[PDB]
From TrEMBL, chain A:
<keyword id="KW-0689">Ribosomal protein</keyword>
<feature type="region of interest" description="Disordered">
    <location>
        <begin position="1"/>
        <end position="57"/>
    </location>
</feature>
<dbReference type="GO" id="GO:0003735">
    <property type="term" value="F:structural constituent of ribosome"/>
</dbReference>
<dbReference type="GO" id="GO:0022625">
    <property type="term" value="C:cytosolic large ribosomal subunit"/>
</dbReference>
<keyword id="KW-0687">Ribonucleoprotein</keyword>
<protein>
    <recommendedName>
        <fullName>60S ribosomal protein L29</fullName>
    </recommendedName>
</protein>
<dbReference type="GO" id="GO:0002181">
    <property type="term" value="P:cytoplasmic translation"/>
</dbReference>
<feature type="compositionally biased region" description="Basic residues">
    <location>
        <begin position="14"/>
        <end position="25"/>
    </location>
</feature>
<feature type="compositionally biased region" description="Polar residues">
    <location>
        <begin position="50"/>
        <end position="57"/>
    </location>
</feature>
Automatic annotation (TrEMBL), chain C:
<feature type="disulfide bond">
    <location>
        <begin position="11"/>
        <end position="76"/>
    </location>
</feature>
<keyword id="KW-0479">Metal-binding</keyword>
<feature type="disulfide bond">
    <location>
        <begin position="71"/>
        <end position="74"/>
    </location>
</feature>
<dbReference type="InterPro" id="IPR000552">
    <property type="entry name" value="Ribosomal_eL44"/>
</dbReference>
<keyword id="KW-0687">Ribonucleoprotein</keyword>
<feature type="disulfide bond">
    <location>
        <begin position="11"/>
        <end position="74"/>
    </location>
</feature>
<dbReference type="GO" id="GO:0003735">
    <property type="term" value="F:structural constituent of ribosome"/>
</dbReference>
<dbReference type="GO" id="GO:0022625">
    <property type="term" value="C:cytosolic large ribosomal subunit"/>
</dbReference>
<protein>
    <submittedName>
        <fullName>Ribosomal protein L44</fullName>
    </submittedName>
</protein>
Length: 57, 30, 93
RNA sequence: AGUUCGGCCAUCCUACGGCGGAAACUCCUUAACUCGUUCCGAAUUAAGAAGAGAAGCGCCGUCAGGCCCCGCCAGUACUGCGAUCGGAGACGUCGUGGGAACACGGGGUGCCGAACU
RNA sequence: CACGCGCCGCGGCGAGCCCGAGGGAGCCCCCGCGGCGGAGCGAGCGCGAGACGCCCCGGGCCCGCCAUGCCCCUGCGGGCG
RNA sequence: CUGGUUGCCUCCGAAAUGUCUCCCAGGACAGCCGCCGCCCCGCAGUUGCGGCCCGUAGAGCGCUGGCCGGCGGGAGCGGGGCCUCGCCCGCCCCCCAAACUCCGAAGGGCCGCGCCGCCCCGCCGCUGGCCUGGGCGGGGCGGGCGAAUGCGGGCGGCGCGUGGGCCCCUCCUGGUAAGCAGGACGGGCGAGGCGGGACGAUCCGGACGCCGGGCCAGGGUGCGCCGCCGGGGCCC
RNA sequence: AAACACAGCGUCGCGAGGGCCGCACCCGGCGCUGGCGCGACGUGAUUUCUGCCCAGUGCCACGACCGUCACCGUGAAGCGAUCCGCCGAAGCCCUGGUAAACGGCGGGAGUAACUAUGACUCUCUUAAGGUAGCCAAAUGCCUCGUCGGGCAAUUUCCGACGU
RNA sequence: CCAGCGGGGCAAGAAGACCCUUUUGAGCUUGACUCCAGCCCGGGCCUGUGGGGCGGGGGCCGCCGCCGCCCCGCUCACCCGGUCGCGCGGGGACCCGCCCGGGCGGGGAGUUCGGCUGGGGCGGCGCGCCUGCUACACCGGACCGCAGGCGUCCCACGGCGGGCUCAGCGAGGACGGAGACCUCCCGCGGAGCAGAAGGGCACAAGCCCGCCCGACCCGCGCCCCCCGUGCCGGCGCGGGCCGCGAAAGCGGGGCCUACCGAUCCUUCGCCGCCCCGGCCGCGGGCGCGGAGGUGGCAGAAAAGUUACCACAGGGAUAACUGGCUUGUGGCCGCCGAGCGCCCGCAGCGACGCGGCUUUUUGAUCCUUCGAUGUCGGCUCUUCCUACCGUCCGCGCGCACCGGCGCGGAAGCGUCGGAUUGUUCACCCGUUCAAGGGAUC
């Protein structure tokens, strides 16, 4: 008793049913895989800037 | 996808035969 | 495959490179007071026969050989894993 | 015009003839020193200045091979969409869009940039 | 239908909340502990949170676990990074 | 695993696929769908314009292989009678390839189509020979909404059914073939009433509340059976 | 029914403190028995016969204790739990016996005055290479084998033949 | 409406007994796997009272108290026999019993006996991975599709630096030849780079030489397959320590695409923590990382048989009718190399090409497993024509007789026997004896 092995017949219609979802607008600015030396320098420059430092007083 | 916490209740014992393991409280006022 | 008798390698205890001596690692003898052994011995008492599975469908014909390296200045032990091979010789200095 | 260092990597390559050097590059001369060749100062390393355009190099030529551009090949081959269009089929046709290749003919044959003479 | 688990809606109170068993001779009235919540992380000895914000997302800092540099009291202890 | 599972109306509405499974008449996770919401941040199964990618049809024999002959040169070698055909070198020529390609479409895929320009200032524990860079911010000046067409968008929670599919068009593979077996873009039946194709789940039209009137798609207009004539040609 | 039984034939075990069987225990049966007996198996009246193989598996040695193979016991070490040695019953291993135990029982070449065949030779090879007999049999695929008998005519039947 | 009849109602009678599946059974077997009675063997207790031998605590002598094994008495335990206990025996501290230990043990018990699959079985392994094609120019894409490969090999066949250029054509050197070795020339790779195939590579990724061990330690992220989970493999980084090189640089193995493995348990390694009334020493456990393996490769511990048999189901799936197909079987056209004394066609007709049929057998699996009674013969009816005799025409290599070919034509005829269940076949005979269909 053999049954079907494979079909992609209806798959493109199912994909378009609710549109093709775009990624989130925060995935474009993640620090997920950035060079660590660059990230460390960015942190220290912000903290020492009086106009953008969040340190209290 | 079902996401539940697993139950930790034991299966019942001696339901149709054996000692009576059910206690009712209909006699509380009396 | 042939392996050198001596190798200059990183030493964790002293934190630098030093000369090490090569040897072969073998499994030790089974103890009778390990917790798993105690549990197994307790479970096999009495009637009932065998209580745990016994493996019988071997497939591989080799093993992964392990070399033991002994630091010659501090007695720190290290291990290196070779790929699968059929016979291995350590050269003699 | 030359040399050093480069960019793009044949319109710059390959073969065969010819022209040229003041300066430059090159070929050239020597083996104490330095360094060197499975053996060899051939190569390479060091030290020179008697010779030379004979090569390399720059330029010219060839009904040259190659490489590059334009035409023709040809709206042909093939093809997207529509057709109760023809045909037993194999295949073809019409409408509406896109559109080659080989071959052949004509022409061409390095520029650009920074420093010195 | 009973018990257990997840999520949603509604009522009461709210850093709190709660007819437990039981006792007062009042099916419905009065009194009535745990518990859960309030602080986490760590195998464990244990150590232990403030810095920003209508809301949401994200950054930035802080606590625990792991690893390091400098200083010092009561010291394999404390502090700062 | 087989059989059965009891009132009405209204609003929405599938899947027969991917991975794992002592899995193949079953399940879990994902997809498709319903309900419940919450928030306020421009969207698109389309064309146009601009950048980049692919090696299929066709074409061809330069590469890797294969394959008919014709004619010339002979250093060397062989057959045969210093001669005469052969191997070799050159040109010409017939026919080829899912696992050949110097060339190469139609066709597809990805990205872009509003903020810009000038000046000055601050921080860095990164980077540079330096007064170099890069990154992140602040302050002033000028300018402005720069393809078409259509149209509001985004996110979360809980949960069901399904996981035997089949047919048409065009494109393929195995097989002598098959209403055979296995794949691909789009559509349909499943789960789509109505008219036509005499007759059919799928073909040609058209996708549905209950009615009156009008117009007419597809298909037809001797009689059964609603609806026809005129003109040109052929004719067992 | 061609199946079972059967008389006959053969093998095996046991001398009582034994053998075989029952049975939870206590106790039982054969047995009111004693080898001309009891129990366990195979073949199946008479006649005539019953070939070779102990490599395999099985069974048996009042054969042997070689190696291995328990608890117990005993020696050393240790704070003790423990650990390491020695000791070594049966069994297996070893050496033999046994087929009316289970069972098994070969290939290729050459060769005699026509041809044909092959008494004969060579060669590989086994634990042993199917003996006396019998046969297209209730057992032969090819096969409805070939020859003879019987029939007008026979895939049936009978007699022969046999790698 | 009646007497009859047996063509239909796939007539009735039964949740197919054949076949397949289900992580549904049972009977039986054994050299399946896990065991149990029973039996054999050893030690100890039951269990007294005496004697003796041996072996262990250069030569022994041992103390007579230490340790083992062994042997021989006695009777009082214990056991057996005879007797109406009328005028008596036999064994014996062994046996038996009980405890622990070893062996034998289908006599008995429980349980298992994979999957895919043009039905199942036999066979094979697209059951984990890799190259090219199938595949129709992004990506993806099936088959028991095509041609193949993997479960390894290497302390150098690895890292780095330097230097060099390979295969080969042509020409020359000669004991020397179709090839040894030497030299020059030109040489886009036609060589080599561990093993499949496809890519890549020239002052190199190839060959030779020098020095080395980055084939290291700590911690993160991404890509491929993909549910955007795991596993194998790869890549990009932050620190530590190193190798080579003048230096810039490069180096987490063999140029790239394959070469491998969870939980539980065991074993090993560094540094620490716990053993809960305390402290100390052994021992146990715990946090991190390797190794021991599951190839049916996301990973149960597993042999047969049923013709005595089942259970739940299945036309999701075989065996018999029917349907589509026509390779094979059967029938029929076209062509004309030749045969035929000569003479392609009176009669034949090679090499090739085009059709038809469903009276053979295959291929497939659409309908039917809560059943359509499965071969042949006997009996009886009807139908086809692709015509064997008889009818009517024509042709001949047709004198007559007898034959052969073609067209129309389905009315009648197509038989009796021996052997075989046979259809078929084969033989004897005769008025000389076609072929088929209708649920074969
Ligand atoms: K499945
Ligand atoms: K070619
Ligand atoms: K007998
Ligand atoms: K024997
Ligand atoms: K026989
Ligand atoms: K006869
Ligand atoms: K099938
Ligand atoms: K039988
Ligand atoms: K039938
Ligand atoms: K025909
Ligand atoms: K049936
Ligand atoms: Mg499926
Ligand atoms: Mg709707
Ligand atoms: Mg499994
Ligand atoms: Mg082509
Ligand atoms: Mg299903
Ligand atoms: Mg079909
Ligand atoms: Mg349905
Ligand atoms: Mg529809
Ligand atoms: Mg009318
Ligand atoms: Mg004989
Ligand atoms: Mg015979
Ligand atoms: Mg006979
Ligand atoms: Mg007979
Ligand atoms: Mg007869
Ligand atoms: Mg009747
Ligand atoms: Mg009837
Ligand atoms: Mg049934
Ligand atoms: Mg039944
Ligand atoms: Mg199953
Ligand atoms: Mg069973
Ligand atoms: Mg059994
Ligand atoms: Mg199966
Ligand atoms: Mg898989
Ligand atoms: Mg180099
Ligand atoms: Mg580093
Ligand atoms: Mg698996
Ligand atoms: Mg019937
Ligand atoms: Mg019936
Ligand atoms: Mg006719
Ligand atoms: Na137990
Ligand atoms: Na926040
Ligand atoms: Na209709
Ligand atoms: Na007798
Ligand atoms: Na036998
Ligand atoms: Na039974
Ligand atoms: Na891999
Ligand atoms: Na079917
Ligand atoms: Na038929
Ligand atoms: Na029939």
């Amino acid at each position: 008793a053999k049954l079907k092995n494979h079909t992609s017949k209806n798959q493109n219609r199912k994909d378009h049913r609710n549109g093709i979802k775009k990624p989130k607008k925060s995935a474009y600015t993640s620090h997920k895989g950035m060079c660590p030396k660059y990230l460390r320098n960015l942190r220290r420059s912000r903290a020492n800037d009086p106009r953008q430092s969040l340190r209290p007083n | 996808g079902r996401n539940v916490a697993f139950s930790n209740m034991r299966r019942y014992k001696c339901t149709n035969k054996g000692p009576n393991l059910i206690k009712n409280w209909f006699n509380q006022p009396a | 495959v042939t392996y050198p008798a001596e190798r200059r390698t990183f030493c964790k205890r002293e934190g630098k490179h030093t000369v090490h001596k090569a040897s072969l690692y073998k499994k030790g003898k089974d103890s009778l007071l390990a917790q798993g052994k105690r549990r197994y011995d307790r479970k096999q008492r009495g009637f009932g026969g065998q209580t745990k599975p016994i493996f019988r469908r071997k497939a591989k014909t080799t093993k992964k050989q392990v070399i033991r390296l002994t630091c010659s200045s501090c007695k720190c032990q290290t291990f290196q894993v070779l790929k699968r091979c059929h016979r291995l010789e350590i050269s003699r200095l």
